[PDB]
A paper describes a structure:
Similar to OtsA, [name] is comprised of two Rossman β/α/β domains which are oriented in a GT-B configuration. As was described in a recent crystallographic study of ValL, a [name] homolog from [name] subsp. jinganggensis, [name] is a homodimer.
Represented within the six monomers were three differing conformations of the N-terminal Rossman-like domain (two monomers per conformation). The monomers of the first conformation contained both GDP and trehalose, and this first conformer was found to also have an “open” catalytic site with similar global conformation to the [name]•GDP•VDO complex (RMSD Cα = 0.705 Å). The sugar moiety of trehalose within donor cyclitol binding site makes interactions with the backbone amides of residues Gly384, Gln385, Asn386, and Leu387 as well with the side-chains of Asp383 and His182. However, the sugar moiety of trehalose occupying the acceptor cyclitol binding site makes only a single hydrogen bond with Arg290 in our study. A superimposition of trehalose and VDO within the [name] catalytic site shows that trehalose does not assume a binding pose comparable to VDO. The second and third conformers have only GDP within the catalytic site and both of these conformers share a dramatic shift in residues 11–50 which result in the “closing” of the catalytic site. Resultantly, Gly33, Gly34, and Thr35 move 10.9 Å towards the catalytic center, and within 4 Å of the ligand atoms. Therefore, the closing of the [name] catalytic site is more likely to work at least partially through a more dynamic, equilibrium based mechanism.
Author numbering:
A (entry chain B): 5 to 20, 26 to 76, 78 to 264, 270 to 478
B (entry chain A): 4 to 264, 269 to 477
The structure:
């Protein structure tokens, strides 16, 4: 019997009664997993509509994915507990701590808010734990799949009630270096770990994340013993195993925005694509393109920055959008009017179409847990587009050889790579794109779900 | 042993001498070089460093191949000042500031918005190379007539020097000492490809690489392993095997120089009269964190019992204008004003001159000492202050200071980013009775006292030897 819980569900209630999940983001991923495994899933009720929906149906709400039909069991939290955790989680706290948003010299500075969110997080965690254990209460052997960085607190709680059941905690974001983790206040930095370690298996998308996690546990829990070879953690009589389970794309979930086809006609098209989130790094990308375009030969080339609006209420995300806009404008002032454009909407089909039309794809994240875009876009591109991929994406551990692996902070290197990519002829690119697509293709959602099960199974058996 | 010490500068002084109208050049004591002269196994010592005044430049021109300084104990040292191309020197200085290098090793970048490397990094890198060579050339050239020369290389700016020595002295013992932190592997990677590997290339050829703290060595090992797929690291032995050369990393903590150990700045005595004094002292550099300290102070005083309590921010100024420094000062002064405007007038004060006496007077007067650096290679103030404090002052110490690995058990140990913890620490420290404080201050001094400058020098000599022996 398999029980899967995910923090986040972006459902929309329109009329064809009609409830559906938004594509992209982790939510769709975990929902797809429920479809593969044929289960219910557990997630939180965000909006009032979600709260209303769960009240009417306690047994489960039914929604259609971007593909399939899944059955969610939403949780109604406290509307002040939950609203506050959805600040803690955000870059203000949790997001900034795992995706490297702090400079230390001037940010962060923790106060009373941190103790309060940390408490609310405890309530939010129990909310989830109680709800897993309940809907799994009539199960002789249950198997727990806990998905993500919000549900970090969860395994410790489950292990109390089900101390012999297999638990996988899977984190979809990076884990930072020990030194950076310590920035977090003491109760949080150890408390988070106290809740993760009781899991049978902790998984990430990349080795670097697993290594950083171990170094953290060794830096903060003295009565702990780690094995960098075995990727293991023994602590208070828990044996925890760390695993890399890379993920690429969903085969199933696979035309152009207004005026784009026209603007790009007879032009080489550079495409940056990513969420309105500072880590996607489109400011630096636009900057690096200007750098390439003074270095000439880039004529007849145009850049398109695809953004997907997301959490624009967090100052950072909206500042990122502003930084990017300013750069685009400055680029157009220097290189000539309409050289670069932004397209900032939420249509996932518009994005895939841009993946298709691209001559050069840039995925230069400052950091990224994986980046599924960098798998999808080659697998759909019809132009044999080159791919500039940052060394700091989890994906680079799988496709870095097959791509122009760049340092996301170096503009000169990013520009030179853009120049190189665009100077390559059709036959050179066709060749490269061919291999890229071969390196990408086998990393399917189905195959990742399998990797979770096979991993958990073997690790549970090695107790 | 024949010893060749290299560092950024050599502490020298000059007068006009009476009865000849002739310049006189001394060599103010307590220099790292003077201490090495005084050791056991060494026959003679030659010091190489950058010229940096019309005195330095003119002396170098007078004796281009070095001159022998006269020490106490009848010892002499050879001091060779390098006259670099000024433009090279200027750009290398800038390259070492928070504009680029300082932020790489002292954790100043948020990744999301800074940094963004341009052509400047490449220009700077090249000057760093030209400067590195200038040094390497000078070292070798004055160790030309030496059979088994021992090379001591100090300071971050001389990092590239070991590779350039081995090239010509493949069997010589070479110690490189780094006085600043070594950042995490993921953070080191932020640097542009040429620089991040470049630096490591120039370092590893040393026999021993030393830092002030374990965390630094570990972070360096993790960098190496992440960046040189050829290299091979051993955490247990703290040794690196790369291209047939085996490097050993040694943690050699330094606390203070006894030779360096006044009177309070104008108006400080009277302003602080019959008041408990909180002291924060550090250079005007972002990492010293003064302002998180002022904010933690407010947080503590708000909860009361900070009655009759006051706070002085000691700051040492910087000769150049570096933006990150200027912004830190703004941030501080804003925090100081918001504190005074809440706790009443003249509750907190900044004092901002360059005078090592005034600093010590402040150390002597302190009722509570704060050293909450965001990061710090060691922080030598946290040893000096307890050893000169006349009032059994407690110490709040960042867990991110190198010094914490030696003094953290003898101080109140803080996460320098957590304001609440810092405030609670301040409150506790100030609630203690004088006897409690006396005891904890005896222990604190007794743990600081051994870590002398001489003990540190010996640790290098001894460790380089042991490591050159395998
Ligand atoms: N709803 C929506 N989804 C998108 C859009 N563009 C891309 N996506 C999807 O969102 C995913 C992006 O994930 P990734 O690039 O790994 O970074 P993430 O944002 O952290 O998931 C991709 O798999 C796309 O299929 C868009 O404009 N709207
Ligand atoms: N030149 C100078 N030295 C100072 C001043 N204030 C303190 N110091 C000394 O500088 C040392 C502090 O160094 P530390 O905080 O470890 O970092 P550093 O600033 O890089 O040396 C202490 O031992 C003080 O004796 C000042 O205003 N000017
Ligand atoms: O601006 C550079 C600074 O370098 C030194 O500071 C380092 O060296 C100290 C000991 O020599 C350490 O205690 C300290 O942790 C390091 O930051 C120098 O002492 C400073 O004065 C310079 O400003």
């Amino acid at each position: 019997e398999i029980f899967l819980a995910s923090k986040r569900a972006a459902i929309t209630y329109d009329t064809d009664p009609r409830a559906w999940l938004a594509p992209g983001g982790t939510g769709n991923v975990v929902a797809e997993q429920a479809g593969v495994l044929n289960i219910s899933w557990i997630a939180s009720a965000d909006s009032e509509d979600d709260r209303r929906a769960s009240a009417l149906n306690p047994d489960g709400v039914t929604m259609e994915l971007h593909s399939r039909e899944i059955l969610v069991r939403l949780i109604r939290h406290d509307p002040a507990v939950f609203r506050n955790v959805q600040n803690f989680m955000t870059a203000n706290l949790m997001w900034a701590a795992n995706n490297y948003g702090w400079d230390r010299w001037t940010q962060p500075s923790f106060g009373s808010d941190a103790r309060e969110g940390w408490a609310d997080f405890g309530r939010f965690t129990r909310d989830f734990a109680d709800a897993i254990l309940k809907s799994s209460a009539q199960s002789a052997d249950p198997v727990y799949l806990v998905h993500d960085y919000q549900l970090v607190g969860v395994p410790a709680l489950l292990r109390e009630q089900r101390p012999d059941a297999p638990i996988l905690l899977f984190v979809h974001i990076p884990w930072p270096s020990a030194d950076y983790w310590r920035i977090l206040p003491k109760e949080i930095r150890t408390g988070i770990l106290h809740g993760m370690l009781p899991a049978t298996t902790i998984g990430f998308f990349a080795d670097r994340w697993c290594r950083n996690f171990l170094e953290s546990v060794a830096d903060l829990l003295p009565d702990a013993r780690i094995d960098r070879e075995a990727m293991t953690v023994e602590w208070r009589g828990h044996r925890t195993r760390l695993r890399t389970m890379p993920l690429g794309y969903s085969p199933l979930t696979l035309q152009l925005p207004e005026g784009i086809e026209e603007w790009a006609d007879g032009h080489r098209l550079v495409v940056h694509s990513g969420r309105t989130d500072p880590i996607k790094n489109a400011e630096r990308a636009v900057r690096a393109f200007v750098l390439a375009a003074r270095g000439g030969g880039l004529e007849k080339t145009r850049m398109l920055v695809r953004m997907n609006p997301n959490r624009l209420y967090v100052p950072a995300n909206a500042d990122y959008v502003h930084r990017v806009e300013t750069a685009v404008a400055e680029a157009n002032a220097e290189l000539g009017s309409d050289t670069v454009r932004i397209d900032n909407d939420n249509d996932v089909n518009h994005t895939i179409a841009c993946f298709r039309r691209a001559d050069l794809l840039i995925f230069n994240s400052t950091v990224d847990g994986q980046n599924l875009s960098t798998f999808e876009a080659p697998l759909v591109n019809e132009r044999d587009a080159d791919v500039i991929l940052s060394e700091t994406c989890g994906a680079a551990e799988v496709l870095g050889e097959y791509c122009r692996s760049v340092n996301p902070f170096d503009l000169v290197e990013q520009a030179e790579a853009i120049s190189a990519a665009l100077a390559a002829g059709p036959r050179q690119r066709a060749e490269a794109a061919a291999r890229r697509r071969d390196a990408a293709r086998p990393w399917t959602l189905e195959a990742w779900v399998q990797a979770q099960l096979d991993g958990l199974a073997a690790d549970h058996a090695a107790r």
